[PDB]
Write a protein that binds this ligand. Sequence first.
Ligand SMILES: [Mg+2]
Ligand SMILES: [Zn+2]
Lengths: 124, 201, 98, 147, 245, 46
Amino acid sequence: AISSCPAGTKLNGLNYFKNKADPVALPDEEYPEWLWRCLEVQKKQRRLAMKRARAQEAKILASGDLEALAPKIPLQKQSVNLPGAVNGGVQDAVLADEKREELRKAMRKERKAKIKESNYLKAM
Amino acid sequence: SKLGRTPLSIPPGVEITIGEPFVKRDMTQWKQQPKRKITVQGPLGQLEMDIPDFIKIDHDAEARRATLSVANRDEKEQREMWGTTWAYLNRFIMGVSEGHTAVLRLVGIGYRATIDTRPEKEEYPGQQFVCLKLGFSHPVEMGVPKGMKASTPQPTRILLEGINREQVMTFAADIRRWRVPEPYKGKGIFVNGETIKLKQK
Amino acid sequence: MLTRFITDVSTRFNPFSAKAKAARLFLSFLPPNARSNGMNITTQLLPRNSTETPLLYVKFKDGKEMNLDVENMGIKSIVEEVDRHSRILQKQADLNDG
Amino acid sequence: VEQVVKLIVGAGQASPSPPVGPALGSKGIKSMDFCKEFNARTAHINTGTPMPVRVTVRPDRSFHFDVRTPHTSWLLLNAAEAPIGKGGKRKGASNPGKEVVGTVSLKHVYEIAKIKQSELRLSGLPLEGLCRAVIYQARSIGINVIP
Amino acid sequence: RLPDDYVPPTQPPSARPVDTRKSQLLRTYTSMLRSTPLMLIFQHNNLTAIEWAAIRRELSLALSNVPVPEGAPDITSKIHLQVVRTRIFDVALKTVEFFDPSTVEPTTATTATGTKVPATYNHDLSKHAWKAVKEATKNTEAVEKTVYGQLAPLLVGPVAILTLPSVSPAHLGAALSVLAPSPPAFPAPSRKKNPGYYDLTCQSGLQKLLLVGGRIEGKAFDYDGIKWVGGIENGIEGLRAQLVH
Amino acid sequence: MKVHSAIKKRCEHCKVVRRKANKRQNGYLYIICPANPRHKQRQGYR
RNA sequence: UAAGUCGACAAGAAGAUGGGCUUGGAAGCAGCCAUAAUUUAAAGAUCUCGUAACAGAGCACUUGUUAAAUCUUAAAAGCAU
Ligand SMILES: [Mg+2]
Ligand SMILES: [Zn+2]
């Protein structure tokens, strides 16, 4: 019951074939599970912030130790060996093979900013 | 230099003869620098040159190779001539065995070229004179330097051949100097696949 | 390297043989559309147990067929000979064209 | 070289016409041959539906074309119940950052990805990442997603 | 304030810059040589984008028809035909073999607070690892005896590596027949059932790929040897036959 | 040719060279460009 | 910077997708709005050309070959042009 369209919702304008009818909304449970997780990528007034925002962040921060204010280097600049071990097993193989793809997206994002930056410095 | 370190592969038939340091007395100068006369003989002919003395040649007659080296890489004078002396020897070896060639293409309506003999202007017995009709009111005729063979497979195509690249490419530049390629119709004399970007209209 | 004048190439070598390294590089220099243009290519891979002398076959559009050893001459030397014969054909075409 | 042309045509509307005539009639290939040939390829699509085509012209004017599924932008707009703009065609948002033309649920997107997977050249990509590429275009046309 | 001697915990002293893709990519292959028991070596010859997608398309379609009766995880997507960097990948084998983390001694490390904490630098990108592979590679004839030396002649020019999370001969038959079919041992898919295989783009891409060699559990394997591995139906059945005796 | 006091490269093919320098004169700094002949520049007078 | 720096050369530089709007036409590239994604060895809803509009040639970027054992790149300062 997490979807807005109940079982039977007629999908308007999705059947380009002539000898066919528009698709019909199938049950919610029958739908795959990844569909319910692919939506993770979607992302005076200033005075009220300093009076409240500036004070609350400093409280949760607890600037007494240097571990909370640590650099926190992004994954695209680290050097610690990934979770790879010899003859670790299938459970470790897939897990090791998942981080190699995680670092992939990290480097992929670095190129966008650089490629977008180089193009900006040439079209002043 | 990264070209001087590269050994010079001497193909079969070529013979390199390295002379010894000498100094030709010049009354106008107080101290001449020693040089080395290098003779490169082979099937097509024989070329010569005088290299500075600071350049050392390790003539390896066993494996048919000769590597060049200077006495000091920190000197600008020795670094420059190191690569230049290598480039000239390369042309000599590959020029006395295979030979150097140059092709000239004559574009333009009414442009022709024929090889004839002009005994009245022969700089030496049997000199070939390339006759060029390039639209001028007078006939253009140039004598090939001693050591070059000029031919025209077609009226609009000249073929120069010689063992010295500097002499071959320099004579082709004298011919092209009569009609330089124009950007409006491509008319001119193109040397070795030279091209010109035409205009819109 | 000029591959336009090359009709077909037939190379036979062993993968684990250190002398066949130059042969592998030669296969990569060929452009992608070499097959669409009509150039036929055949590659024979030898077993690892027994290693036979690597063979490199080259043929131009003028009937010339070249055969060179992959051991003595390195990749820098094989590219040389293929360019020499392929260059004279480029000039030969211009002389007889137009 | 073998040039390629891009043109959008109707389902069964194959005849000398701006989308067809000047698209390939100037190159040299037989136009009428393509019209009568496109009808056989498209004989089960509703009359008037847009149909992208990638026609390839080999040397000697021997043409061959591979039919392609309808545009995704046309499917989203046609599936988002957007208001038909000028000329009888649904239009997207002029300012996707502010304006909103429609809202499509995640379940609707799942069906839009399957129809697009019918293409062979696009059948290898997983369907898990294919639904995110279409959601990536909704932000460019001003269509929000509701779970 | 962070002191000068303080070093991030997730960024120990590396032998070379870590931001560059050279060392960042080396760390990837290092873990791939340990996480992937079965690895096949290929050679791509100027394959176009459309051709690459077509080649990887038949794999996803072919590898999806393999059964999973033993209940193992759905190993049907982690198999990728990834193109690697021959130069950097050549050093990966050196490190995994000529470097042992146990040969490193712990040293005091200063945190953000300044307290001395003992730490050990065992990352493959460390200065100790860089010194081990070099001194180990100094000897030439001795390296030819190891598994690395047996695979060094293959890491020449462009090379593509296929990664399989586990040693499953069933998946090998579905991949070895789409990438390097060798009938009758591994016949190619039929035309009446897999028309996508015999396409204008796919057919022109498979001819550019060549199975130069393969690596299994850190052991060199020849082309003819991979047929013996893939020839086996399943690994568990091979062990049961030896038990009947 | 445009004679300036501040010669600058106007594209990727422009090259800075010092020509006409011999035993009698010091020469001038040129901006030679094979692509566009409008990028030709010189620094100094005779 | 031998984990091949620098330079050159060879190939690649994708797909959803002619983004939406505008316009006689706007397909990366007149202009306006947006520019979380996806898949890759890598690939900006696009940096310079090109087209009436497509097509097409380059760049960012990616792999390979050649090859340096005091030899990469940039800045500042000193004296010169
Ligand atoms: Mg637009
Ligand atoms: Zn310029």
